[PDB]
């Protein structure tokens, strides 16, 4: 890995939904559904 960049969501500048979508991604990351969604597509 040359860099260590991150994949977020594309929100407009000064969006009202961005803090709510940030804590939504945090709550989804705590429940482990992100790991299941990662493990449902990257195989072959």
């Amino acid at each position: 890995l040359i860099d260590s960049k991150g994949y977020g969501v594309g929100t407009p500048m000064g969006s009202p939904y961005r803090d709510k979508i940030t804590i939504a991604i945090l709550q989804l990351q705590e429940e482990g559904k992100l790991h299941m969604m990662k493990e449902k597509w990257w195989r072959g």
């Binding site: 594309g10 929100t11 407009p12 000064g14 969006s15 009202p16 939904y17 709510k20 979508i21 804590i23 939504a24 709550q27 989804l28 559904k33 969604m37 990662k38 449902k40 597509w41 990257w42």
Partner: protein, 472 residues
């Protein structure tokens, strides 16, 4: 004894009387019934109804009333007729009362007049203090009337002394053409708009902006009119719109609410327009201002027992023998009425010291958020309660546009024989993430593909972008 009060009002062409004239007669009847003030004096009224901008008609009816004998003239609303009857009243020593604001030349030497509309210097300072509280940088000011730019002087003076960028736009002379103005608002990212119009024009502009999809949480509106609580806010209540306004009618009082409910019975005889986007039964600002005008003039009559009705002529200009003492008693009056504190300036005779109720729109409706005074400035009632963990039901009902790019297992094109249409046209990791986010927050969403087909990078030549970043 008896005492005649003369009122010039707008002539309705067909139908019921106006709100100002009805509030004038209701004020006269309410003073003439309750013996709290002036027990030994009963007041009578004479009303003359004129058209718009006919100051010759206004001067003729004022001369007819002064030939009849009037202690104090409650003048008209529009500016030229108000200035004409102001010159009539100052010429003969008769007191003059203003309800609506008018523009006065500063070199005018007339002094036989008072006004109860708040001065727009103080209102402009209140709007500037609200803007400085909200920490804005780019403000779009929309004004309706060409004389309305005088009402927003200090906002225009503000970029000289502060850091601010104004974009001033005029409404069209046609009433229903707010759609190209709001189309101009959508370009250029106009987000913080200060509107300066009547509340009927505000209702029409809010309808035309709801139809154009500008009732989002991005925009913030400040209305300079003093009757935003009378506005129907039922479709705009759950839209999450940042909206702030001013109130002068302190409706939380018991006497104010009882007077409002008594006057609503007289209002329901007049048929209103129920499809105009106006909330029913709420008194306007000028009706309560005329009620407080009759009340404070009766207060000034109460401290003068030598008040006699004397007729005067217009062909000669003999001054009135009771003009100076009664005008000094009017200007030194002070009363708590429907607009709260009522006092006058010793120099201009304009209402410049008052109270303002800074209100705003939330998800439950309109609610008071602060108090403004010319001495204390702004005073915001602080609200930070916390506990934000109800985000599952937050973003419950907002249509949302999601833009992806048709590559990678994040956004995979669905492969099936039947050509379905909708949000389930795609699969992959990002569609699963969108399904999980719509499971959590609950927002209605749609997926439209990016027509550029690029991720997005800054073009170093022109400074522009492309793809998802420019589309955002």
């Amino acid at each position: 004894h008896v005492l005649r009060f003369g009122g010039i009002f707008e002539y309705v062409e067909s139908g019921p009387m106006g709100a100002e004239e009805l509030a004038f007669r209701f004020a006269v009847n309410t003073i003439n019934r309750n013996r709290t003030l002036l027990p030994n004096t009963t007041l009578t009224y004479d009303t003359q109804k004129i058209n718009l901008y006919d100051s010759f008609e206004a001067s003729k009816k004022a001369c007819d009333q002064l030939s009849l004998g009037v202690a104090a003239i409650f003048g008209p609303s529009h500016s030229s007729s108000a200035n004409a009857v102001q010159s009539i009243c100052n010429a003969l020593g008769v007191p003059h009362i203003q309800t609506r604001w008018k523009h006065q030349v500063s070199d005018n030497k007339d002094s036989f007049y008072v006004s109860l509309y708040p001065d727009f210097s103080s209102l402009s300072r209140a709007i500037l203090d609200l803007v400085q509280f909200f920490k804005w940088k780019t403000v779009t000011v929309v004004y309706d009337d060409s004389t309305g730019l005088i009402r927003l002087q200090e906002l225009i003076k503000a970029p000289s002394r502060y850091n601010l960028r104004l974009k001033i736009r005029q409404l069209p002379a046609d009433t229903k053409d707010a759609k190209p103005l709001l189309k101009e608002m959508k370009r250029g990212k106009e987000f913080h708009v200060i509107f300066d119009c009547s509340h009927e024009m505000a209702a029409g502009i809010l309808k035309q902006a709801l139809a154009m999809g500008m009732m989002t949480e991005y925009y913030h509106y400040i209305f300079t009119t003093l009757d935003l609580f009378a506005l129907d806010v039922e479709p705009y209540r759950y839209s999450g719109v940042n909206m702030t306004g001013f109130r002068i009618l302190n409706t939380e009082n018991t006497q104010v609410s009882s007077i409002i409910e008594k006057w609503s019975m007289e209002r329901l005889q007049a048929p209103p327009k129920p499809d105009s986007g106006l909330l029913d039964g709420f008194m306007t600002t000028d009706a309560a201002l005329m009620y407080d005008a009759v009340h404070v003039v009766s207060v000034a009559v109460q401290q003068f027992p030598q008040m006699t009705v004397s007729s005067l002529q217009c062909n000669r200009h003999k001054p009135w023998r009771f003009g100076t003492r009664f005008m000094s008693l009017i200007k030194e009056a002070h009363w708590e009425g429907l607009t709260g504190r009522i006092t006058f300036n010793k120099t201009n005779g304009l209402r410049t010291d008052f109270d303002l109720d800074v209100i705003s729109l939330k998800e439950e409706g309109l609610e008071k958020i602060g108090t403004w005074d010319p001495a204390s400035g702004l005073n915001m009632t602080e609200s930070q309660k916390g506990k934000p963990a109800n985000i599952t039901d937050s973003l419950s009902n907002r249509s949302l546009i999601v833009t992806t790019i048709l590559e990678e297992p994040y956004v995979l094109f669905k492969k099936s024989d039947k050509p379905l249409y909708g949000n389930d046209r795609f699969e992959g990791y990002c569609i699963d993430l969108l399904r999980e986010l719509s499971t959590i927050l609950g927002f209605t969403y749609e997926i439209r593909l990016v027509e550029d087909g690029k991720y997005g990078a800054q073009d170093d030549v022109n400074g522009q972008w492309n793809g998802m970043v420019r589309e955002l």
